[PDB]
Amino acid sequence: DQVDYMDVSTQQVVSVGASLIPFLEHDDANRALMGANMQRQAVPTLRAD
Amino acid sequence: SSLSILAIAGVEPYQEKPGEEYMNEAQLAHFRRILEAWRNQLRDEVDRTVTHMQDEAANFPDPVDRAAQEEEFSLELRNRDRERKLIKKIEKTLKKVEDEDFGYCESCGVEIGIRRLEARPTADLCIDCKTLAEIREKQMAG
Ligand SMILES: Nc1nc2c(ncn2[C@@H]2O[C@H](COP(=O)(O)OP(=O)(O)O)[C@@H](OP(=O)(O)OP(=O)(O)O)[C@H]2O)c(=O)[nH]1
Ligand SMILES: [Zn+2]
Numbered sequence: 001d002q003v004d005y006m007d008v009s010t011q012q013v014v015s016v017g018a019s020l021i022p023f024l025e026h027d028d029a030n031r032a033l034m035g036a037n038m039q040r041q042a043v044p045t046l047r048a049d
Numbered sequence: 050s051s052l053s054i055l056a057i058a059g060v061e062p063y064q065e066k067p068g069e070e071y072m073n074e075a076q077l078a079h080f081r082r083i084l085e086a087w088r089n090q091l092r093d094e095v096d097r098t099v100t101h102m103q104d105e106a107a108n109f110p111d112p113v114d115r116a117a118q119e120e121e122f123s124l125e126l127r128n129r130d131r132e133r134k135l136i137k138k139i140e141k142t143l144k145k146v147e148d149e150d151f152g153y154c155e156s157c158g159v160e161i162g163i164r165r166l167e168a169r170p171t172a173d174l175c176i177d178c179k180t181l182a183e184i185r186e187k188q189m190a191g
Contacts, residue, residue, distance in 0.1 A: 030116060030117050
């Protein structure tokens, strides 16, 4: 009988780029950072899968 | 429970006898034993830390894992610094015990409870003065 509010959903902490990485819960913060940074640099291949 | 400060030494909580005077030889010896054990433990922990630090340190070729290996060291050194700051307090308390001027508040002459001294053996003030001083401190700081 004291909680005034509650998080809307789990994903609200992180941006879209980081939100796309699976199993963030098991990754060190630094490697998540580097992961997102490089993931945004991917080049479109010939046939998307 | 083997996790408190009386656990470090093999001593169990004291028990003031009915007609027991306040500061007797036995209590002072008790507290000296407690403090000595606590200290020796802290210093052995420092030795552990240093051996670890001396073994691990290496030159990493990736800048995002050198930070990883130097972000746990910062916390470790933080804890070690804090305990080093407490080693001076323990030293001073050991000086008061050897001088036989231990167990009383420095502000008012009231004696500090035995159970509080078995709680935090480095206590310098009584609970009342401690609380008032902590408030004055936190207020003058922020
Ligand atoms: N491991 C350990 N360290 C202790 C303990 N008690 C005090 N210290 C460390 O020694 C410092 C000295 O504290 P005091 O100035 O005597 O304040 P106090 O009377 O409340 O203990 C503390 O400052 P501090 O401001 O609390 O440090 P910090 O908060 O800036 O990190 C703390 O860092 C303890 O019981 N265990
Ligand atoms: Zn007092």
